[PDB]
Ligand SMILES: CC(C)=CCN1Cc2cc(Cl)cc3[nH]c(=S)n(c23)C[C@@H]1C
C-alpha cells in the first residue's frame with residue numbers, strides 16, 4: 041500500500057453539507073448497484089448517522105454506449121479543500137527529448153481508486169443514495185480512496201506514482217519514464233526485445249500496488265499525437281496544419297488562421313503573418329467578412345507552400361553544443377533557429393516583441409538573445425553559442441554608451457545580410473561652423489532665421505518633437521539643436537531607428553541624412 | 566525529526582506562507598543543488614515533502630569566494646517579510662556605530678552554526694523549496710527544513726543566545742575587536758595592523774570551531790562620499806555655460822544657496838553653441854561660491870531607523886558606476902563611485918552584481934540594514950546572470966528601472 045497523504049480543509053471551514061437532488065427510481069437502482077460494487081472492493085464503506093456532511097451524486101450514461109455511471113458533484117468540497125502543490129503547467133517541449141530506440145505508453149487506469157485517502161479526511165466525502173420508499177434505507181457512504189474528480193486526487197496520485205517508481209528507476213537508470221494524466225511514458229535505447237521485456241517488468245511493478253496496466257496488444261504506438269505535436273522515437277514535429285481554401289473570410293477565420301500560422305513558427309521557418317494581421321484593422325464584428333489584399337493573398341499562398349513541406353525537428357544530443365542563429369526577417373521581425381548539427385534545427389522561432397515605443401535593431405537583437413537564452417535554459421539547461429548578424433565593434437559602441445546594463449553570453453559574427461547597424465550617431469561635442477537652432481513649435485537661429493508653424497490637435501510633448509523636426513528639415517548637413525524637452529532629448533538620444541509614432545520616424549529619417557548632429561538640453565525659462 | 570527544544574515561531578497575524586516561483590536554473594546549478602541537498606537530507610537537515618504543502622521559496626547555487634565549492638543560496642526574502650518580528654527589551658544586538666569607523670573589518674560566514682538547531686515542527690512547511698528539472702521532464706524534488714535555515718531572519722534570533730555564549734569569551738578577551746552579526750554573516754572589525762588583524766581573524770575562527778562553528782576584508786575607514794563637481798576649464802563656450810546652468814539648476818533643489826543669475830545672463834541671446842563667452846567678474850564669483858557650496862554634503866541629513874534605505878545606481882561607462890543611498894528624495898545619506906574589479910572579464914552584469922554587493926556590505930556595516938536597489942537593467946537579464954557572480958549570503962530587495970539621461974550627466 042502507499043503512505044497516506046494528510047489532507048486538511050481550508051482553515052476556518054466545515055465540510056460540505058449539501059442536499060442530494062431528488063432521484064429517479066431507475067437511477068437509484070443503478071446507484072445502489074454501483075455503490076455496493078465499490079464497497080465490496082473496499083473503495084468506500086457505509087457510515088452511521090454520525091456524519092452530517094453530504095455531497096450530491098447523479099447517474100449518467102456512457103457516451104454512445106448504453107449503461108449507467110456514477111458522478112459525484114465535488115464542487116463544494118473542492119472549494120473547502122486546501123490547495124496542493126498540484127500540477128504546474130510546466131510541460132516538456134519536444135526539442136528537449138533525446139532519441140530512443142523504443143517508447144511505450146502504459147495507460148494507468150484509474151489509479152485514483154488504487155490510492156488510499158487520509159482517514160481523518162474520509163468523513164468529508166460523505167454522500168447519500170436515497171431509498172425507493174419514503175421512510176427507509178437511504179444508504180450513507182464515504183470514500184476510502186481518492187475520489188474521481190476530487191481536488192487532491194490528481195496531485196496525490198502523481199506523488200504516489202513517483203514514490204512507487206523510485207526503485208524501478210534506480211534499478212534501471214537507462215530508462216526514462218514520464219507521467220502525464222492517466223498515462224505512463226517509458227522510453228529506452230534497448231534493442232526491441234530487451235525493451236519489450238523491461239516494459240512487462242514495469243507492468244508487474246504496478247500490479248503489486250494495484251495499478252492494472254494494458255497488455256502490448258492494445259497499447260498506443262508512435263507517433264504520439266500529444267499537445268499539437270507528433271512524437272517519434274528519433275524525430276518530432278507538430279500535428280499537420282491544413283490551410284482553408286475559402287473565398288470569403290470572416291474576422292474569426294482570419295484570427296484562427298493567424299493562430300494556426302503562429303503555432304507552425306516553432307518548426308516551420310518562413311511562416312509569416314504580417315499581411316494577414318492587417319486584415320484585422322478596424323474590424324467591427326467577429327462575423328464580418330474581410331476580402332484579402334494582394335499582399336495577404338501572396339502571404340497565404342507562401343505559407344500554404346511552406347506547410348505542404350513536412351519539416352520536422354530533431355531531438356537533443358547532450359554530447360553536442362547548442363548553436364543559435366538569428367536573422368532579421370523584416371522590420372521588428374527576427375527569426376532564429378537552434379541546431380546542434382550544421383543547419384538543421386531542434387527548434388526554430390520568431391521574435392517581434394517590441395519593448396517600448398521606440399528602439400533600434402541593436403537593442404532589439406539583444407532582447408531576442410535574452411528570450412532565446414531563457415528558452416534554451418528552460419529546454420536544454422544551458423545557453424547556446426549565438427551566431428549574430430552584427431559586428432563586435434558595432435555592439436560595443438552601442439553598449440558602452442547606453443545607460444542600461446547589458447550582456448551577451450558568447451557569440452560569433454555571421455556575415456549574412458542584412459547586417460544590423462546604427463544608421464546615425466549624435467555628436468558628443470557641439471559642431472563648430474554649424475548653425476544653431478533654438479527650438480520651443482518654432483525655432484530661432486544664431487544666423488537670424490526663424491519659423492513659427494501651426495500645429496493642430498498636437499499633444500504637449502508631440503509639439504516638442506515637431507519643433508525639433510522643423511529645425512531638422514530646414515538645416516544643412518551639420519546642425520546644432522538646443523531644446524528644453526528632456527522627453528524629446530531622451531528619445532532622440534536613445535538613437536532609435538524605428539518607432540510607432542510617424543513623427544519620430546520622420547525625425548529618424550532626417551537624422552540619417554545628416555553629416556553631424558548635436559542635440560542639447562537646457563531649462564528654458 | 567528533531568532533538569532538544571524547538572522554539573515556536575509564527576507568521577505575522579493572518580499571513581500565510583510564501584508561494585514564490587522558481588526562476589529556471591541551469592543544468593550545472595541543478596546538479597550542484599542535487600548533490601548538496603542529498604547530503605543535507607542524509608544529515609537530517611531537510612526532508613522530502615508531499616503534495617499537501619503548497620508553499621515555495623526560490624533556491625540558487627552560487628560560488629564560494631576562491632574555492633571550487635558551490636553554496637546553495639535560498640531566496641527567503643518573501644518568507645522573511647512574512648515572519649513574525651522577534652521580541653523586545655534587552656536585545657544585545659542593535660548596531661555598533663563604532664564598527665564603521667574601524668580600519669579593517671572581515672566578514673565570516675557563520676551560517677553553518679544554524680544547522681545544529683531544530684526548527685519548530687509547525688513552521689517547517691513554510692520553508693518549502695523545489696529543485697527544478699531540465700525541460701520539466703520530472704516533477705521536481707521538493708524539500709523543507711528541519712533545522713534553522715540559512716538566510717531566514719528567524720535563524721539569527723533563535724540562535725542569538727547560543728551565539729552570545731560562544732562570543733562572550735573572545736569579546737571580553739579582545740575588547741579591542743568589534744563583532745557584529747548580520748544573518749549568516751559575522752562582521753569583525755579592529756584597528757590592529759593588517760598583520761595582527763588576519764592573525765586575530767584566524768584565531769576567532771578556531772575559537773568558533775571549538776564549538777562546532779566552522780574572506781571579505783573591508784576598510785570602512787577609507788570610505789569617502791563623492792561630492793557634486795563642476796567642470797573647471799580654461800575658456801568657456803555657450804554650450805559649457807548651458808550645461809553648467811542645467812546642472813547647477815538641479816543641485817539647487819538640494820543646496821538652495823546655489824544661484825545661476827550671472828551665468829544665465831551670460832546666456833542671453835541666441836549665440837552659437839561653440840561661441841566662447843568670457844565670464845563677467847560677477848559671474849566668476851557666482852560660479853566660485855556655487856563650487857564652495859557643493860564641496861560638502863547637504864547639512865541636516867539624518868538616518869531614520871524607521872525608513873527604507875534606497876540605493877540608486879547609474880551606468881557612467883567604461884566600467885564606472887555611481888550610486889546614492891537615501892531615504893527621502895535628494896536627501897542622501899551617502900553617494901559613491903564604482904569601477905570594475907577582479908578580472909579582465911567584466912561585462913555590465915558582473916560589475917552591477919559586484920557593485921550591488923559592495924553597497925550592501927557597506928549599509929550593513931553602517932546602518933545594519935540592507936537597502937532597496939533600483940537597478941539600471943532589464944529584469945530577464947538580471948534574473949539570468951545575477952547568480953553567476955553573486956557571492957553574498959543575503960539577498961536585498963531589488964527593483965528595475967529606466968535611468969533618466971539627465972541624472973547620469975549630473976554624476977561622476
Ligand atoms: C508526451 C511526452 C511528454 C512524452 C515524454 N516521454 C516519452 C517520449 C516519447 C518519445 Cl517518442 C521520445 C522521447 N524521448 C524522451 S527523453 N522521452 C520521449 C521522454 C519520455 C519517455
Ligand SMILES: [Mg+2]
Nearest residue numbers: 478479480564
Ligand atoms: Mg529654448
